[PDB]
């Protein structure tokens, strides 16, 4: 599909409790996202001068917009943050969002970062009160085009990714629901999730996705303070 379509759908997904068009600027944002993904993989530094030279060229006057849109894509789609390390040379580095120690690449140049989807899953569990029926998780993920039993063009097979990979990584718990027979399944945060982030940091990420303040999620804000 399209990186920016999926970004738009991720912002919809986070509003579940309440479209990009093809032009030159769209192409310049995708090309920059590709360049930023290349630098992330080798922890390469990138400058504003490199971004102009290799991608922006004759759209220098749209640089602020293209960089902002590309930076939003890197975060919400790939869980990569763009951080300024030198204001004078306009030098930036690419690090994993919420400082998670996982991106699912594992020195593999096919693989797309999975930290974006991991943060969304942790968010959704949080959003449903820190324990979510499996079927409700799949319903919410359907909003961003992620489906159990279907190969996803960025993230691979989500059913295995959530119930296997992220259980073995201890980001998630996936278990039989107590009192159910025959058996239903639920997700919670795993111990690595609690060790690497907090409810309030995840609420801020969620809120920021749609330009909203965390306080505008009153129940989730109160739950995040209970920590």
CA distance to 7, 8, 101, per residue, from 188 (Å) = 24, 26, 19
Listed in sequence order, the residues at least 6 apart from 203 whose beta carbon sits closer than 8 Å to its beta carbon are: 126, 214, 217, 220, 221, 224
Contact between 220 and 203 (Cβ < 8 Å):
yes
148 vs 13: CA distance, rounded Å: 16
21 vs 24: CA distance, rounded Å: 10
Question: Is the backbone peptide bond immediately before 100 cis, with ω within 30 degrees of 0?
Answer: no
Q: Is the dihedral of CA 11, 12, 13, 18 positive or negative?
A: positive
CA 212 to chain CA centroid, nearest Å = 17
Residue appearing with tokens 């060229």: 57
CA distance to 78, 194, 195, 198, 203, per residue, from 227 (Å) = 27, 10, 12, 8, 13
121 vs 127: CA distance, rounded Å: 10
> Residue 92 class from Cβ within 10 Å (0-12 exposed, 13-18 middle, 19+ buried)?
buried
Structure-token pair, residue 7: 């970004």
Listed residue (206, 163, 144, 176) closest to 2, CA to CA: 144
| End-to-end CA gap in the chain | 38
CATH architecture of the domain 3-99 equals Orthogonal Bundle (1.10)
Listed residue (11, 10, 55) closest to 35, CA to CA: 55
Classify residue 145 as left (phi > 0), alpha (psi -120 to 50) or beta: left
173 vs 193: CA distance, rounded Å: 10
Residue range(s) occupied by CATH 1.10.10.1210 in the chain:
114-226
Residue range(s) occupied by CATH 1.10.10.1200 in the chain:
3-99
- Return the CATH number of 114-226, one of 3.40.50.2300, 1.20.59.10, 3.50.50.60, 1.10.10.1210: 1.10.10.1210
190 vs 206: CA distance, rounded Å: 19
SS (H, E, C) the chain: CCHHHHHHHHHHHHCCCCCCCCCHHHHHHHHHHHHHHHHHHCCCCEEHHHHHHHHHHHHHHHHHHHHHHHHHHHHHHHCEEEEEEECCCCEEEEEEHHHCCCCCCCCCCCCCCCHHHHHHHHHHHHHCCCCEEHHHHHHHHHHHCCCCCCCECCCECHHHHHHHHHHHCCCEEEEECCCCCCCCEEEEECHHHHHHCCHHHHHHHHHHHCCCCHHHCHHHHHHHHCC
* Beta strands 91-96; 80-86: pairing state: antiparallel
49 vs 55: CA distance, rounded Å: 10
């Amino acid at each position: 599909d399209d990186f920016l379509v999926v970004v738009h759908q991720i912002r919809q997904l986070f509003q579940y409790q309440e479209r990009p068009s093809q032009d030159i600027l769209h192409d310049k944002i995708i090309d920059l996202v590709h360049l930023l993904l290349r630098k992330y993989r080798v922890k390469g530094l990138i400058t504003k001068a490199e971004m102009l030279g290799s991608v922006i060229k004759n759209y220098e006057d749209y640089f602020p917009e293209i960089f902002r849109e590309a930076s939003v894509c890197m975060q919400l789609l790939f869980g990569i943050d763009v951080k300024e390390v030198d204001p004078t040379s306009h030098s930036y580095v690419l690090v994993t969002s919420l400082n998670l120690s996982y991106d699912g690449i594992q020195c593999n140049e096919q693989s797309m970062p999975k930290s974006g989807l991991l943060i969304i899953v942790l968010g959704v569990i949080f959003m449903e009160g820190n324990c979510i029926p499996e079927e409700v998780m799949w319903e919410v993920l359907s909003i961003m085009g992620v489906y159990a039993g279907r190969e996803h063009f960025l993230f691979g097979e989500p059913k295995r990714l959530l119930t296997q990979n992220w259980v073995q990584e201890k980001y998630l718990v996936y278990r039989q629901v107590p009192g159910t027979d025959p058996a239903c399944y639920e997700f919670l945060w795993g111990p690595r999730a609690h060790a690497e982030t907090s409810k309030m940091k995840v609420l801020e990420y969620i809120a920021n996705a749609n330009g909203r303040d965390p306080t505008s999620y009153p129940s989730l804000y109160e739950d995040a303070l209970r920590e």
